Design a protein around this nucleic acid. Structure first.
Ligand SMILES: [Mg+2]
Ligand SMILES: [Mg+2]
Ligand SMILES: [Mg+2]
Ligand SMILES: [Mg+2]
Ligand SMILES: [Mg+2]
Ligand SMILES: [Mg+2]
Ligand SMILES: [Mg+2]
Ligand SMILES: [Mg+2]
Ligand SMILES: [Mg+2]
Ligand SMILES: [Mg+2]
Ligand SMILES: [Mg+2]
Ligand SMILES: [Mg+2]
Ligand SMILES: [Mg+2]
Ligand SMILES: [Mg+2]
Ligand SMILES: [Mg+2]
Ligand SMILES: [Mg+2]
Ligand SMILES: [Mg+2]
Ligand SMILES: [Mg+2]
Ligand SMILES: [Mg+2]
Ligand SMILES: [Mg+2]
Ligand SMILES: [Mg+2]
Ligand SMILES: [Mg+2]
Ligand SMILES: [Mg+2]
Ligand SMILES: [Mg+2]
Ligand SMILES: [Mg+2]
Ligand SMILES: [Mg+2]
Ligand SMILES: [Mg+2]
Ligand SMILES: [Mg+2]
Ligand SMILES: [Mg+2]
Ligand SMILES: [Mg+2]
Ligand SMILES: [Mg+2]
Ligand SMILES: [Mg+2]
Ligand SMILES: [Mg+2]
Ligand SMILES: [Mg+2]
Ligand SMILES: [Mg+2]
Ligand SMILES: [Mg+2]
Ligand SMILES: [Mg+2]
Ligand SMILES: [Mg+2]
Ligand SMILES: [Mg+2]
Ligand SMILES: [Mg+2]
Ligand SMILES: [Mg+2]
Ligand SMILES: [Mg+2]
Ligand SMILES: [Mg+2]
Ligand SMILES: [Mg+2]
Ligand SMILES: [Mg+2]
Ligand SMILES: [Mg+2]
Ligand SMILES: [Mg+2]
Ligand SMILES: [Mg+2]
Ligand SMILES: [Mg+2]
Ligand SMILES: [Mg+2]
Ligand SMILES: [Mg+2]
Ligand SMILES: [Mg+2]
Ligand SMILES: [Mg+2]
Ligand SMILES: [Mg+2]
Ligand SMILES: [Mg+2]
Ligand SMILES: [Mg+2]
Ligand SMILES: [Mg+2]
Ligand SMILES: [Mg+2]
Ligand SMILES: [Mg+2]
Lengths: 47, 274
RNA sequence: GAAACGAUGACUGAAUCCGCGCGGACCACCGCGCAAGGCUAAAUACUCCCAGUGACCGAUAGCGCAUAGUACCGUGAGGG
RNA sequence: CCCCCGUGACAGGGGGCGGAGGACCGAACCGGUGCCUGCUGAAACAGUCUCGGAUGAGUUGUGUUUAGGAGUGAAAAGCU
RNA sequence: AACGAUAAAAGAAGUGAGAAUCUUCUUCGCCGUAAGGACAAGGGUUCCUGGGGAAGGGUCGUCCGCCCAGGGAAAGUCGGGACCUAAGGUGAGGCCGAACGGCGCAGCCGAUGGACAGCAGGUCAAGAUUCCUGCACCGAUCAUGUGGAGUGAUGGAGGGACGCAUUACGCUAUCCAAUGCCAAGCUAUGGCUAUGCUGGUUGGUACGCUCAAGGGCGAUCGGGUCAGAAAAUCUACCGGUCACAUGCCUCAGACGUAUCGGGAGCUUCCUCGGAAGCGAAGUUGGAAACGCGACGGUGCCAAGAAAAGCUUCUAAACGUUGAAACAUGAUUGCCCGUACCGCAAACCGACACAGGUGUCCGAGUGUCAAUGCACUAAGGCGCGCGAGAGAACCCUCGUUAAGGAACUUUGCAAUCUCACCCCGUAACUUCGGAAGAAGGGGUCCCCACGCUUCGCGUGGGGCGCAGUGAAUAGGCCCAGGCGACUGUUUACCAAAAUCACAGCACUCUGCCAACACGAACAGUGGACGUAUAGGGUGUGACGCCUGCCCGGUGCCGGAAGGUCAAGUGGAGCGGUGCAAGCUGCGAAAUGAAGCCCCGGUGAACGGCGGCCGUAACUAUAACGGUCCUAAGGUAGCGAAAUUCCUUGUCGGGUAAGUUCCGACCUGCACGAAAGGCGUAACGAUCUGGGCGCUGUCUCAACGAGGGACUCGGUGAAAUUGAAUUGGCUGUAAAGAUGCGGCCUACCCGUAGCAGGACGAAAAGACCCCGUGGAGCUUUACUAUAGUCUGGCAUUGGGAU
């Protein structure tokens, strides 16, 4: 019928982004633990 | 007294409605009309602490100073008796002879425009701010504080009357509406009379909607739920209990005193609400 | 457990030299000791990185990659 | 509300006028009642025909809040 | 097999290496409250030009949303920011907390909202309230003037400022009519020769003693200090005073005049067709918004955000020979967003996918009306495989002789029925209702007559089988069970008898309320609520009602006594050294709640039950009824959603009735708020009967459309030990094509059937096993959040 993924720019960014991911400890942690895996895709800010 | 309804719709029989024919029709004073948002029962953690709260109709706060001692020693005159959706009672509009308007709670009878006072130097009339000691023995009153200046926290629902059993020490004995006898520091304030609305108690709600319109989301028998959900759950049929009646939290409902056993109030209650 | 000693949470908070602490309950004896103040290189651990070697691999092996955390999947963490 | 009609201890009865309702028929919208088709589908849940609400406890956009023995639930251990 | 909807295509012309598919033309077919148009969210160059053809395209492609290259997007007035605040998110100091951290006032962020200055036309291949033309508006700084003394905040008030439903007058959009006006040409095929046919018929701005429904509206003096910290020309109370009708005020809109546009077409050039010039009319009549006048009127209970801009006062402050306000000229104009797809081939669905996606505009004819139905306009398409065949069978549809539920688990399905008007309408009832009950009759075309119209009644005529002629369009009734009702529910096998509900009932709760989330004396909900409130629990409208048992459990209360922890107190025991002594152990009495114990408590948990004997073979259809726990069924009901015996017995209906309805009572095993028994009405509930209608059936037939079959194009799948894979009897691990024997059988294929290959699909979900698991339960075990409780610390003086 209708689907799981209905994009929302403001949602996307205010949810997964960088100011967001750094706002919390475990997101700092997500950050550097990504960086280590050599992500080009650091964060949905980087889309 | 109460409006009623011919049975044109199934639910438009038992339904009943207030008598607001004595309500000075008016959009409550601007500099007194704060904004109440609703709270699903969730608190600042977003979990439903209170349970079963939901929507209804947009409401606003009308500040009703209860400590009249901010303007006692002078009088005001009643200007209107408008309709507050947040109180079980009706409220009235004070025009203080010296400018300032206020809102106070409205008692039983008090006709629109009677000029009422405030101060220990006040006549036992309906609507007077009067300390509890200066109140006659056996007089009828409401709006009673648990300390001078705090705020009136007693007798506020429709047609309620705390009754001066009489003085004693500096703590005046008092008859709470619940059927309880309470000591009150005679420097406490009062507002003479029964609350009024009174008719309230009786209005038949009539249909689901009418519950919703006051924002009381549908209540739920745990006897519906399942084990996982709540105590009385499970079973194979419109099932009994199998344990003693009990809240979701398992702390018994039906005949279990719940007040905290040691307390500071325990030497101000001469009797029990029985 | 016969539970010494240290160690602290709550109550108690002694002696300072003819004194204090321990010697696996506890006592005398007889021994080892100076609580309540601090710093301290050295040997030791690791290895993102640099170099040298190899009865280690040579394209399904070897890191995941002869390179790429890319293509691709995932709203995301993440997988790859 | 407004007139005439009614006085056995009786709320009443006609006409005007009025616009009430979890009223009614019914598109949009909301939902899935029965059958059939579809079942390596057109689609990981639908199509046609039929049917339910259709001013109410209604329908929906946007911003936002609550979560894992936790949330949320007009209650099916459903949904997350 | 399939090529992704059965909206449908033909012929000509062109191009090319090649064409059913690409480009012109002329038709046909489909959408037209869309399948048109405009936005938003999302996507990201998909837009336009020129080119390409590997692959993407379900075939083909010369084509494309694919490939290449190049271009295209323009704002002071639209939208967002340079302004505001909501929910929410934050947040120095502040309150807490093993850490990370959790709170949290002001302030700040936060549009989905408040605020706010521009409209009409023109055009690129591709932009448009941006650019260009024409005429506006707003803020800002300077200057010449009118200056000629006040300006008016980080505080004051006013204002901003709001609900649903229904509705009066005026009006615009916008659409219809016509021998209005303008323009165009023509005579068709029997006629028409215009009184026919086709098309167009006012947008902006400015003024104007012109017309105008609607709508807002008071004013000034004085008092009270005590209202807004104070101030106070203000704002709020009190008082006085003012030509009620009103005028004061506004002008949606229309009429006039002017000016700028636009306008059917007409002309001219010319290159798969456009470039450029020109330009007529501008009427009467009618309809009419969800739009505007507007913040209008009335009714209603459920009682309808905030803040800035804005308007008014005053405080300081610098001024009071440059204070405001104003006119005019100059001058200035930041930041991103503007292409295109945007109900879809361009977003979300892995796809050029029968799904999903929020707001606006959405013409005409016919129709009681309408966003309804048929057909259309503008516009948009014919959905990216084709052609033929005209078997079985399959899907969607038409018609049907005689019969009419014989079908069957059941009328499942399908027909009946169908709109508007007029007649008429039952038991039952809560007087609302049932109810569109039922059952009839009318409906089209013409002429005359009346009436309030487009319209309609009446009268007479006319035609066809029929006149809501086509399409949209209820079958109805009798009687039960369950629930009262509208609602809710298992996303993706259950929509109900579930659940909710209004109502009633028990209890709990006196405010830092119980109760609930919680590192936690934080903070929060409860609630800015206050016992006519709040929590929890149960029943489930309404109506008559709701009995008997307090022994066990729970709960409330009671206190004599039995008691019980640490702690208080240590008589006495012993270890040791000569010893003063250090020490190990430890008894009496006292001692907390709680349990034992005494009583009360059912709309608390619950309980309201055992049994007697019959002729015969160790036995079957049947018996009438005395009654141990605390009591042993009051009303009402009863073969039921409950019934074992079971198709109980009787009655009704049927030709015939395990079903159904009434009664019966021997209730295996109804019963009163886990409600009892009823009840109008409601029901995509469930059950039986009827009337009507019917291919459901007897029993199928003919026809149609889409498949299946044939040809050209592209071309999957699950399966698969390997096969060169017959039948009967038998044997074999017991169901053999493979062994035995005997029969039969030439090689290959095609369309079809579903018996076999214990056919495929998922290591069976039933069952047993595992000292496997997880959910749930309690008076199974153990802890434990929480919570009660004595002592201890915060923790103090005193009086007796
Ligand atoms: Mg309830
Ligand atoms: Mg259940
Ligand atoms: Mg279950
Ligand atoms: Mg439980
Ligand atoms: Mg239970
Ligand atoms: Mg120690
Ligand atoms: Mg190799
Ligand atoms: Mg490799
Ligand atoms: Mg309704
Ligand atoms: Mg649903
Ligand atoms: Mg085929
Ligand atoms: Mg196709
Ligand atoms: Mg076709
Ligand atoms: Mg041609
Ligand atoms: Mg050629
Ligand atoms: Mg084609
Ligand atoms: Mg469209
Ligand atoms: Mg293109
Ligand atoms: Mg191809
Ligand atoms: Mg070519
Ligand atoms: Mg915070
Ligand atoms: Mg906005
Ligand atoms: Mg604006
Ligand atoms: Mg703006
Ligand atoms: Mg401009
Ligand atoms: Mg009108
Ligand atoms: Mg004509
Ligand atoms: Mg002719
Ligand atoms: Mg014409
Ligand atoms: Mg502010
Ligand atoms: Mg863009
Ligand atoms: Mg396609
Ligand atoms: Mg599609
Ligand atoms: Mg319209
Ligand atoms: Mg139309
Ligand atoms: Mg239509
Ligand atoms: Mg298109
Ligand atoms: Mg042939
Ligand atoms: Mg027939
Ligand atoms: Mg016949
Ligand atoms: Mg049927
Ligand atoms: Mg009647
Ligand atoms: Mg009828
Ligand atoms: Mg005839
Ligand atoms: Mg006829
Ligand atoms: Mg029908
Ligand atoms: Mg129901
Ligand atoms: Mg389901
Ligand atoms: Mg279903
Ligand atoms: Mg005790
Ligand atoms: Mg019989
Ligand atoms: Mg019941
Ligand atoms: Mg229903
Ligand atoms: Mg029958
Ligand atoms: Mg072929
Ligand atoms: Mg062989
Ligand atoms: Mg053989
Ligand atoms: Mg087959
Ligand atoms: Mg197995």
């Amino acid at each position: 019928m209708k689907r799981t993924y209905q994009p929302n720019n403001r949602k996307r960014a205010k949810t997964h982004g960088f100011r967001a991911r750094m706002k919390t400890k475990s997101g700092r942690n997500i950050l550097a633990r990504r960086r280590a895996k050599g992500r080009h895709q650091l964060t949905v800010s980087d889309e | 007294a109460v409006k009623k309804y011919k049975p044109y719709t199934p639910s438009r029989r038992q339904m009943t409605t207030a008598d607001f024919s004595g309500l000075a029709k008016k959009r409550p004073e601007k500099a007194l009309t704060e904004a109440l948002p609703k709270t699903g029962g969730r608190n600042n953690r977003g979990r439903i602490t209170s349970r079963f709260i939901g929507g209804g109709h947009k409401r606003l706060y009308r500040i009703i100073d209860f400590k009249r001692r901010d303007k006692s020693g002078v009088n005001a005159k009643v200007a209107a008796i408008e309709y507050d959706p947040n109180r079980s009672a009706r409220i009235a509009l004070l025009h203080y002879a010296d400018g300032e308007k206020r809102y106070i709670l409205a008692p039983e009878g008090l006709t629109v425009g009677a000029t009422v006072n405030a101060g220990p130097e006040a006549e036992p009339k309906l609507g007077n701010a009067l300390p509890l000691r200066f109140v006659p023995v056996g007089a009828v009153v409401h709006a009673l504080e648990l300390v001078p200046g705090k705020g009136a926290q007693l007798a506020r629902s429709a047609g309620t009357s705390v009754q001066v059993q009489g003085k004693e020490s500096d703590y005046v004995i008092v008859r709470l509406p619940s059927g309880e006898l309470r000591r009150v520091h005679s420097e406490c304030y009062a507002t003479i009379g029964a609350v009024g609305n009174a008719e309230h108690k009786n209005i038949v709600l009539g249909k689901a909607g009418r519950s919703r319109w006051l924002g009381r989301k549908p209540h739920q028998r745990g006897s519906a739920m399942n084990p996982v959900d709540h105590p009385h759950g499970g079973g194979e049929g419109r099932t009994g209990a199998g344990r003693v009646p009990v809240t979701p939290w398992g702390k018994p409902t039906k005949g279990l005193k719940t007040r905290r056993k040691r307390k500071t109030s325990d030497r101000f209650l001469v009797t029990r609400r029985k």
